Amino acid sequence: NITLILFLIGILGFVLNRKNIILMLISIEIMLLSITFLILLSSLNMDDIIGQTYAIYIIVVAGAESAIGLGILVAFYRLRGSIAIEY
Template identity: 65%
Template sequence: MNFSLLFFITGILGFVLNRKNIILMIISIEIMLLALTFLILFSSYNFNDNTGQLFSVYVISIAGAESVIGLTILVAYYRLRGNISLRT
């Protein structure tokens, strides 16, 4: 559980400290979702429950869809502005 907490805090710090780079923000969100998945899997293993494992697969699929949508928005932003920096 400490590993997932460390991962989640790393994701939050990455998101807060890198507010000017969209790619690093998306990666930080993915790290937070991975930490959540690790926590669900760990809890599922401790309680001997298969529902948590199914839910973790659901979270991973939602995270993949979220990253695809984020990268699509990033490509559209790059085509519109010419760079991916959030500074104006």
């Protein structure tokens, strides 16, 4: 239930935000944690170590994609000098 509310918070990050692109990166991190938390709790209910394994690979991949996204942001910011959307 908490995991569902957290997914909304990550969803709501995209609704409320017109100009903060950094918040877009953070809202993906919230969504991914919410989905991993749901898998972890379900894996506990169904006594299944595969759920924990799936969550570990989501942490690995979401950590890997955070680094790519920050690198892409750095290449973007090197040329623009701002992460602000003019709106």
